[PDB]
Each structure stands twice: as structure tokens, then as C-alpha cells.
């Protein structure tokens, strides 16, 4: 009545608490792998960055963005969406490749013209070279990536293991690599097409790093979110508990009145 609907709702809240707790634990398990990956990947990336720095390479365009298939990871999906939208002011005509369902859906809504290629089946998995390489191979062919002397990728940098700032970076096209200020100290060879190879290689190597960073931020955010969820459920337990206790007393009182009314006669 009151009593059962209170009780059922309180049971729901309890079950929710348990689930959000559970989710938080599984999130932690996943988080360990995610962070580990992000370290190894970043070290590899840094080896490439050493070149780009020393070369002082620098530099339509591509937009690539990444947010997993899965949601309830927090606002990873929508903070990234907002930050994509900000740089979509800059170039409205840029072609957005959406890696994973959550980023796909949100960006698809704001502009569907941009969406030309999109992926799926990424979010549930931990990033792997296999994915990046194949995505890259498709990026060149499908998006005519080389035509665009600008490529830019969006991901979520896991700022702290409690925070995430959505971030973007520019991938270095083969044109950029050619004209890089220092490139003379580095040895080029006419029997190599180091721009055309290095572009391709760093398309993937950077992308894998970006994916690892994103995945870590996503899983970290989810852990944080699922923890905060447990707290919100607890508060709901407390309010309905007081109500439950009050309701119990009230039932006794209403029943008592009937008995008294009977007794009086």
C-alpha cells in the first residue's frame, strides 16, 4: 500500500546499491589493465615524439574521436562531445570518424554530414595494435586521409586517476614530415619514402596510444561514477528507511482505531 510500495522501492534501491557497488569492483579490475596499457603505449609514443620534437615537424582535415560502445562511464562521452563541437566550430566541414558507439551517437546527432566512417566493437575490448592498424588502413583508403594534410584525433586524457580532460592532438601528415625544419640531420634516402611510411606508422602508433589513454580515462571515470552512484543510493536508503519506520507505526495506529471503534460499541 504505502507499506509494500515503500518496501518494494526500498528493495529496488538496495539492489541498485549492490549493483553500483558491484560495478565499481569490476571497474577496478578493468582499471588496473587499462592504466598498465596506457603507460607502455605512452612510452612507445614518447619514442616517436622524440623524433617529432627534434625534427620540429609540426602540423580538409580529419577529426577522429573515441568513446566506447558502453555508457555509464560518466560524462566521458559528453565532455568529449562538447570538445569535438568546439573544434567543429573551427572547421565545420571536417570529417569525423567515430570510434565506438557513445561518441558515434552523440556526434551523429549534432552533424551527420561529417560522419562518413564510424567503427564499432572497440569499446568492450582493451585497445590492440590489430585494431589500430586495420582502422588506419581503412582511414587512408576510405577517408583519403593523405588528401587532408591535417589529421586530428580526439580522445580522453586521464588527467588524474580521479579526473579526465578530453584532449586532441594533431597527427603528422606526410607533407608535414617532408618540410619539417630539421630533417637534414636525420638521414633521408631516395630508396625510402620515409614520409609515406612514417605517416602511416605514426597514424597507428599515435592512434593506439590515444586509444589506450581514452580507455583508461573511460574505465577510470566509470569507477568514479559507480562509486558516486553507491553513495546516492545510500542517501535514498536513508530517506525511505525513515519513511518505512514511520509507515509501520502508522499501520498499527490505523488498525488500533478500528479495534477501539469496535470496542466502544
Amino acid at each position: 500500500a504505502t507499506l509494500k510500495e515503500v518496501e518494494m522501492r526500498l528493495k529496488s534501491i538496495k539492489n541498485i546499491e549492490k549493483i553500483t557497488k558491484t560495478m565499481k569492483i569490476v571497474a577496478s579490475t578493468r582499471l588496473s589493465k587499462a592504466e598498465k596499457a596506457k603507460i607502455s603505449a605512452k612510452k612507445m609514443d614518447e619514442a616517436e615524439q622524440l623524433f617529432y620534437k627534434n625534427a620540429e615537424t609540426k602540423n580538409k582535415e580529419l577529426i577522429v574521436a573515441i568513446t566506447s560502445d558502453k555508457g555509464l562511464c560518466g560524462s566521458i562521452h559528453s565532455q568529449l562531445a562538447k570538445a569535438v563541437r568546439r573544434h567543429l566550430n573551427d572547421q565545420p566541414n571536417a570529417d569525423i570518424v567515430t570510434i565506438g558507439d557513445k561518441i558515434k551517437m552523440q556526434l551523429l546527432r549534432t552533424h551527420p554530414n561529417n560522419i562518413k566512417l564510424s567503427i564499432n566493437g572497440i569499446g568492450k575490448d582493451a585497445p590492440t595494435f590489430q585494431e589500430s592498424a586495420l582502422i588506419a588502413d581503412k582511414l587512408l583508403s576510405v577517408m583519403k586521409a593523405g588528401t587532408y594534410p591535417k589529421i586530428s584525433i580526439f580522445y580522453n586524457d586521464p588527467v588524474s586517476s580521479l579526473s579526465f580532460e578530453p584532449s586532441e592532438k594533431p597527427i603528422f601528415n606526410a607533407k608535414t614530415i617532408e618540410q619539417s625544419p630539421s630533417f637534414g640531420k636525420f638521414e633521408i634516402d631516395t630508396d625510402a619514402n620515409v614520409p609515406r611510411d612514417l605517416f602511416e606508422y605514426t597514424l597507428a602508433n599515435q592512434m593506439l596510444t590515444a586509444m589506450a589513454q581514452g580507455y583508461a580515462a573511460e574505465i577510470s571515470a566509470r569507477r568514479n561514477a559507480m562509486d558516486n552512484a553507491s553513495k546516492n543510493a545510500g542517501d535514498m536508503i536513508n530517506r525511505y528507511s525513515i519513511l518505512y519506520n514511520r509507515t509501520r507505526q502508522a499501520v498499527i495506529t490505523n488498525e488500533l482505531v478500528d479495534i477501539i471503534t469496535g470496542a466502544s460499541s
Binding site: 555509464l72 560518466g74 560524462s75 559528453s78 552523440q106 546527432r109 561514477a225 552512484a229 543510493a233 542517501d235
Partner: peptide, 11 residues
């Protein structure tokens, strides 16, 4: 909204 924030609800 209370159990889970508005960012996890539809835009």
C-alpha cells in the same frame, strides 16, 4: 537524476 546524474540521461 538523484540516483544518477543528468549527464547519464538523454541530452
Amino acid at each position: 537524476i538523484a540516483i544518477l546524474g543528468m549527464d547519464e540521461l538523454s541530452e
